[PDB]
Amino acid sequence: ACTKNAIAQTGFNKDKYFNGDVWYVTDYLDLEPDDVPKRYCAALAAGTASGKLKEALYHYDPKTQDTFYDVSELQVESLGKYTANFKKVDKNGNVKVAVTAGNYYTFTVMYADDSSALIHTCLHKGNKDLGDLYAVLNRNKDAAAGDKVKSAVSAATLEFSKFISTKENNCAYDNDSLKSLLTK
Ligand code: FDE
Ligand SMILES: [N]
C-alpha cells in the first residue's frame, strides 16, 4: 500500500512539464522494493492533446524483455497532483486492456525544471498491493542527477543514495511512439 502524501512543487509550471516532450526515468526509489525489479527501463511523455491532459508511459524490463505502453487522460486533484486511469496499448495506440475502475495511478510533481524532475507515483492495479514509487526524471536519458533534483530529494526527506539507477541497462527508447501516444 501507499503511505505518502507527496507535496507538489511550489509554483509548479504545468505548461512546461506537460509540453508533449519525453521524460526518462534515470533513478527510482520503490518503498516496497520487491514490488519492482532491480533492473528496469521507463519513460513517459506528458502533454495536452486536443484540449485533454494526457500521459503516455513506456516500461521495459531489460532482462525479461517484458514491454508495455500505456496512455491516460489525467484528472487534476490540485496543481502538480494528478490521477491517471490507464489503458494498456501497443506502441501505435491500439487498446490491449481498456480503462477500468481500480486501474489508476496518482502522481505528484515534487520538483521540476526544464531538464529534470522528481515525481511520486502510487499505482493501483486490480487486487495487487503496490507501494509508493519515486522517480528522478531527465530530458536526457543519460544525465546524471544534478544538484537541483538531488536537493529536492533531500528536501523530501529521502536519501538519493537509496535510489536505483537505470543507466546500466542498455535502455533504448522509441521516443516517436511516446509522443504519438499522447493523441491516443
Ligand atoms: C521501475 C519502474 C519504474 C516505473 C515508473 C512508473 C511511472 C513514472 C509511472 C508508472 C505507472 C505504471 N507502472 Fe511503473 N515503473 C516501474 C516498474 C513497474 C513494474 C515492475 C510494473 C509491473 C506491475 C505489475 O503488473 O505487477 C509497473 C507497472 C506500471 C503500470 C501498469 C500498466 C498496465 O497497463 O498494467 C503503470 C500504470 N511499473 N510506472
Ligand atoms: N510503477
Q: What is the DSSP string of 113-156?
A: -SSEEEEEEEEEETT----EEEEEEESSTTPPP-HHHHHHHHHT
Please name the amino acid found at residue 60.
Y
Q: Determination technique for this PDB entry?
A: X-ray
Q: How far apart are CA 96 and CA 40, in angstroms?
A: 22
Query: In angstroms, what is the span from residue 142 Cα to ligand 1's centroid?
Result: 21
Longest distance between any two alpha carbons in the chain, whole Å: 40
Residue 53, beta-bridge partner list: 48
Pick the CATH number of 1-184 from 2.70.50.60, 3.10.50.40, 2.40.128.20, 3.20.20.70: 2.40.128.20
Strands 67-78 and 81-89: antiparallel
Q: How far apart are CA 41 and CA 93, in angstroms?
A: 20
DSSP 74: E
From 59, 86, 87, 125, mutation site for ligand 1 pocket: most ligand atoms within 8 A of C-beta:
59
Q: Is the CB of 130 inside a 6 Å radius of any atom of ligand 2? A: no
Tell me which long-range contacts 98-102 makes (C-beta under 8 A, separation of at least 24). 102/126
Domain boundaries, the chain: 1-184
From 94, 123, 134, mutation site for ligand 1 pocket: most ligand atoms within 8 A of C-beta:
123
DSSP 83: E
Q: Which residues of 48-71 are buried (b: 16+ CB within 10 A; e: fewer)?
A: ebeeebbbbbbbbbbeeeeeebbb
6 C-beta neighbours (distance < 10 Å), count:
20
124 labelled ligand-binding:
no
Task: Ligand 1, residue 119: give the atom nearest the CA.
Answer: 8
Task: Ligand 1, residue 105: give the atom nearest the CA.
Answer: 37
Q: For the CA atoms of 65, 35, 88, 64, what is the dihedral angle to 10 degrees?
A: 10
Pocket around ligand 1 at a 6 A CB cut-off: 25, 28, 36-37, 40, 42, 44, 57, 59, 68, 70, 86, 88, 97, 105, 121, 123, 125, 128, 133, 135
Which residue has the CA at smallest separation from atom 34 of ligand 1?
88
Rg from Cα positions in the chain: 15
* Cell reading at 99: 480503462
